[PDB]
Amino acid sequence: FVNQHLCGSHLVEALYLVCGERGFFYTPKA
């Protein structure tokens, strides 16, 4: 995606660069 498989909030910065406006839903929950 980015050039290297580096772990961090950069893939949440990527979720703002894609979905942006709504925040994010995510999986297991109450």
Added chain:
Amino acid sequence: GIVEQCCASVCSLYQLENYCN
């Protein structure tokens, strides 16, 4: 979460979309 896949493999955009609304 599927964002630990980006810490251990070739991170891809379908992993982002498939987690939003």
